[PDB]
Amino acid sequence: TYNTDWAAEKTKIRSFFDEYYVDNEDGSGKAFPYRDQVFEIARRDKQAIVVNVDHIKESDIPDALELSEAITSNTKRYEVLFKDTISDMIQDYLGDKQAPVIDALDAYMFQRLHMDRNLQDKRKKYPPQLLQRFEVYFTTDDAAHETCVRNIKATEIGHLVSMKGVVIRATEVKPCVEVMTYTCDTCAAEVYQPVKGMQFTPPVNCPNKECVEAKANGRLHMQLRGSKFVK
Amino acid sequence: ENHVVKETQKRKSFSRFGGSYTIKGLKGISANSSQVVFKPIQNVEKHNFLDDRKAKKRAPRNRRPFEIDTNSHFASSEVRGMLRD
Ligand SMILES: [Zn+2]
Angle at CA A73, nearest 5°, toward A167 and A231? Predict the structure, then answer.
């Protein structure tokens, strides 16, 4: 009684990005603003897309209501599918060109992918949080999702919720770990560990098969030029 | 003079910050890999392949060399004169 065919859902999501439009104010044509924002990410003038679920709900597309309900009911999963479809759209726009290097992690990734050269290998070697470098956020305006702090209870876990309130306390911005990278002493291999939640446990012993078979006992040392941080 | 020279050499050996470096041209154990070091090496010939870590192999207990110890000392002039006589 569950659906896990991700390719069909990706097809639906990409059809939304292709076919949502707004008419030009002079009547000269149509704007396709979501794919314009995707191309802004592709040329690196941007870092995030904010998607309005009510636009999906009121779009002139088959299965639009079902897609909106699925997004609202399991939002923590559909973020991954939106990131995957935007990554495929970025590669279709970009072609054989390269996106510009702007920071040390971009320089490390662009240098290391061609060191590896000198899709199965890419997706097995690198986690998707490191391969994809943009943010996706959702919004709602319909009053069905309006609630108070008092009303958010056990039925709302995992769902998208909207509310309105006053800010009492706020901290300053801190660096938060997203992906750690370790390198072995003896065999010079690398380990990538993605982090979820507010804790992580670092691995100790090298997992690479040649190092393990040789019993070289190489330690793992963490490196922050390859590791990923977020505000 | 030995103590002063040794201490100044040792305290002049240390270096401040860190980093990590690749020795391009030396192969690693795993495939397509170059050697990697985690201290600011002066020159490539100073590299040691971490032989300081590795535990030395021992001979079995039946086959190790052994000395025989005689308590031997340079006694005082009094005792040496008496023994010479
Ligand atoms: Zn290793």
Answer: 40
For testing the chain A interface, which of B22, B24, B26, B30 should be mutated: the one with the most A CBs within 10 Å?
A: B30
A187 is in an annotated binding site: yes
Q: Resolution in A for the shown PDB structure?
A: 3.8
DSSP run (H or E) holding A230: strand A220-230
- Minimum CA–CA partner of B49 in chain A: A186
Residue of B29, B39, B48 to mutate when probing chain A, most A C-beta within 10 A: B29
Q: What is the SS3 assignment for A50?
A: strand
Of B28, B38, B53, the CB nearest to A187: B28
Contact B50, A221 (CB under 8 A): no
CB < 8 Å & 24+ apart, contacts of A127-130:
A127/A179, A127/A192, A127/A194, A128/A80, A128/A83, A128/A84, A129/A178, A129/A179, A129/A194, A129/A228, A130/A179, A130/A192, A130/A228
> How far, in Å, CA of A89 to CA of A94, rounded?
9
